[PDB]
Amino acid sequence: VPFVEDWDLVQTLGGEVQLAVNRVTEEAVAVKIVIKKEICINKMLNHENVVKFYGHRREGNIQYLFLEYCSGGELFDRIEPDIGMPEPDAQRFFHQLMAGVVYLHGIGITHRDIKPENLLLDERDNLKISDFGLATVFRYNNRERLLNKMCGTLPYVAPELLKRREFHAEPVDVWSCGIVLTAMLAGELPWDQPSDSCQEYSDWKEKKTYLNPWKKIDSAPLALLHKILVENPSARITIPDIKKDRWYNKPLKKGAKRPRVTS
Numbered sequence: 260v261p262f263v264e265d266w267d268l269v270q271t272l273g274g275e276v277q278l279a280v281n282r283v284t285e286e287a288v289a290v291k292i293v294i295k296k297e298i299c300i301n302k303m304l305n306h307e308n309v310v311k312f313y314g315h316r317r318e319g320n321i322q323y324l325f326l327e328y329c330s331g332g333e334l335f336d337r338i339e340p341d342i343g344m345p346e347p348d349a350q351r352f353f354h355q356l357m358a359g360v361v362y363l364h365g366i367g368i369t370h371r372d373i374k375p376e377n378l379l380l381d382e383r384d385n386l387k388i389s390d391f392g393l394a395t396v397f398r399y400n401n402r403e404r405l406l407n408k409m410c411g412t413l414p415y416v417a418p419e420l421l422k423r424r425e426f427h428a429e430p431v432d433v434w435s436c437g438i439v440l441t442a443m444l445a446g447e448l449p450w451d452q453p454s455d456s457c458q459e460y461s462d463w464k465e466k467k468t469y470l471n472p473w474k475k476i477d478s479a480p481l482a483l484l485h486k487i488l489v490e491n492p493s494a495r496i497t498i499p500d501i502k503k504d505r506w507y508n509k510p511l512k513k514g515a516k517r518p519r520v521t522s
């Protein structure tokens with residue numbers, strides 16, 4: 260079948276990311292224009308809450324990464340500044356975020372930069388983890404490797420990354436997921452960074468939940484945030500225990516609006 264391999268670049272999505280449309284079939288894909296680690300990690304990935312990798316092509320200097328187009332856009336744009344989003348939506352997005360992170364950690368992969376800009380939504384608003392540019396292997400041949408590299412985005416990083424020389428990879432991703440949950444429910448980030456010099460971080464450690472963003476958050480999701488945003492990574496709640504939390508398992512959201520008629 261001729262021309263099936265020809266893609267037209269339609270518009271800029273976010274190096275640069277372009278919306279690419281097939282000449283013959285009109286299938287939409289995201290093309291990232293730029294690496295060797297990012298491609299190898301992306302080849303390992305296959306999960307319903309992780310952005311799909313179709314393949315890669317190199318034209319001399321430029322690397323073309325062919326990835327899943329997510330028409331719902333970024334989770335970032337579903338968060339209303341200083342308000343957030345309805346709690347049932349946040350619970351559903353947090354469920355899918357946990358499924359994706361369980362998957363990654365299960366195959367020994369740490370994302371290291373979880374934030375709403377990197378969380379994409381497909382046509383049916385299914386959350387997809389994206390951007391494995393800062394991702395690394397923390398478990399190989401069933402042997403854990405402690406991390407020491409400084410990476411991520413300061414409002415989302417765990418405090419051990421700023422205070423300790425070495426740290427376990429999994430509690431760092433758990434912490435950023437808790438900052439994402441804060442953002443979804445309050446529409447604001449609690450601190451610039453998790454340090455004693457940060458007044459907002461000190462107030463949280465002093466349990467001053469009468470202040471923002473915490474006063475906007477209901478006691479059930481806030482009790483979960485109290486277990487995730489724990490300064491000691493060894494005391495911090497793990498994903499298996501996040502899955503047993505009362506709010507995590509609280510019935511809140513109805514299913515997708517199904518078409519129906521009466522009489």
Ligand SMILES: COc1cc2c(cc1OC)=C1N=NC(c3ccc(-c4ccc(O)cc4)cc3)=C1C=2
Binds near residue numbers: 330333390
């Ligand atoms: C700003 O609006 C959008 C941003 C968007 C999209 C849609 C948007 O609006 C509908 C979109 N779809 N796929 C992407 C997209 C972007 C980046 C990746 C990605 C995945 C793995 C990786 O190693 C590096 C980057 C994978 C997919 C994207 C950015």
